Symmetry: C3
Subunit: 251 residues, 3 copies
Amino acid sequence: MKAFEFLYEDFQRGLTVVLDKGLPPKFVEDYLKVCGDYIDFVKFGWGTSAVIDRDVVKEKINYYKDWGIKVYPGGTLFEYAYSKGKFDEFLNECEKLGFEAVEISDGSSDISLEERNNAIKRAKDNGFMVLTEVGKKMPDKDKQLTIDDRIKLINFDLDAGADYVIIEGRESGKGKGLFDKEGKVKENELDVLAKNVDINKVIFEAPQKSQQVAFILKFGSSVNLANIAFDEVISLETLRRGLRGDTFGKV
Amino acid sequence: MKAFEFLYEDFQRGLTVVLDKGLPPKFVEDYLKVCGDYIDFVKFGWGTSAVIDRDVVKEKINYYKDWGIKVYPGGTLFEYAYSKGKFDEFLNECEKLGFEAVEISDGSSDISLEERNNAIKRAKDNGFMVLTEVGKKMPDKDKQLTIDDRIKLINFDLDAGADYVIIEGRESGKGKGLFDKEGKVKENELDVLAKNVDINKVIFEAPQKSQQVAFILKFGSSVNLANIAFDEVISLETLRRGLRGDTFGKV
Amino acid sequence: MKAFEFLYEDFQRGLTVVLDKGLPPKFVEDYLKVCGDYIDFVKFGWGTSAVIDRDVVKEKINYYKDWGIKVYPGGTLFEYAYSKGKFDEFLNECEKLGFEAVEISDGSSDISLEERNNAIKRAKDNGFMVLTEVGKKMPDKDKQLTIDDRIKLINFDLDAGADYVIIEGRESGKGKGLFDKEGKVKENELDVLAKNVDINKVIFEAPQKSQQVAFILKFGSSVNLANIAFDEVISLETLRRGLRGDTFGKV
């Protein structure tokens, strides 16, 4: 039970996906005792997994598993392996390490629709949950994706068997996807998503508190959010509950 | 004893109040071995307490108690409970969990002077230290408070039995209270406080290092500061001692 | 071995120097199991050492030593001790605590060339590795140092027996040394360094990810970097390896 349980009001709580960019192992064990109940998935950011000791990676995945949290490596790592013709070795290693999900992305590389479709299907066939990601890392490339382009890709990924589709904003949440150079949500672009796709299948990267607030006020506390800093999981739950100033009386 | 004890010069050290927005329990135990000697009070930010496991909350309060640190829940949580007519249940739970203090605020809700006075007195009557808070969360509301308004409220709260009064700046320290949109201290507004209230009874929220520096240079190292990030307690003590560049030779 | 070891490509990896501004002791023990292999040196920032319990300082130095990491106190602490005529007591305490290196700087105080030369030599004579630092803490003083001034001081310090010379940018990485008010690298100033000094003897403070990216793209992954946040050591290694978006395919 929570402290002040008498104040709790039941609600439809969206997904929380954390960015883990290299948390220490015992720290993860400790940390989950405070906020493990509010984490659904964790991304080991980009290629961070590939720099960490193999047993430490396995260890961490188990700690998350003790709280029912599925872990995936970043799509950037998939893209690196894919570009080297080592996608199979990538899936095999993922299975051996214990990742329950994989992210398929094309943020840093050119992957055709057919290649993308087939990578999703191969990952699914191997028993992984699959999250895809729509967006490009670099602003010159990302700018070439219109909102209608993003919508088409979301539904393409779902058709291929993706479980969820992530809308990219990077850890910075600046100048990429739905966010302008100052990190403010592009309201018009976001409306065109709200009316064209199944929002329950979409996860919005929202690393900044101001972004989390904007998404909660627009879609409700049922909104799915990703790239949540590990130390803002509790904050995010308070925002969903109207127990932080930004959403008090508004949720 | 401290390392390099021969360099230490005794001084009048103001209060340090930390923002704990959800630190893990064993981490707190470990963390206090480094900087517990420089923490007076800790705020479990806003309604964070109300999302955390009850035994974990109790556990953390005890760890802080082992270093002589008093803990209070955020005034935002008080405001939520108060607005639901559950202030009594709120005080009872606070006592059961072990909080030694409570924050009374009106940052997100309308609380009249009489209601405010009576809430302070009720908390005091129940054995809590009471810290009040002056300010509004949202800039449209906060702007309506003039400096003279803030001064009047400080002394009203003290009259009611408040132990300390906190000047609100939020965790961001931007666009609220004494800080402009860029987080810079409003020097003129601050002078009008320096000459009209007992500064020893006031605690300034100062989440940004630049704010801590501004307050130390204005009032001295005896200044009371709040919303100090957990990982900047040591930094803050070095600033008070002139052992970081910003205050070297100036304190 | 690392996870996804089959993706690893050997490369010339520059130094990583971490800023430790007060990490808890058991946290350090845990933290090094994830990224201790990618840390060469750690700076206990400025005078932080002088506020921490002496046995905790010794304890931490040992944890770092278990991963082959040398620790030094900040040059600001040296400057304080030096200004009080307690440089000898400073070196003795450093030896007793277990620091394997010392930083000699003049960021907050006036130290002549002869005084600087002699302090370097005294530290070396006492068995310390010596890192010096070029730059001033305050922008009004730092602006008076031209690039040619910095180059001359680098080689002066090396002549005196310095092991490395650090180019100062502070923890903020703003408005000081090679960085403008917005934290962007001054490309022209940096070119004049690239062509005039032994870059292998220089360590660039680069607290911001954007700075780390700029230095890696300019000098390569062999570049030496300092003031790396403890939680960005893994990120930095991924950047060196082209496994984060910013340097994917560029390294």
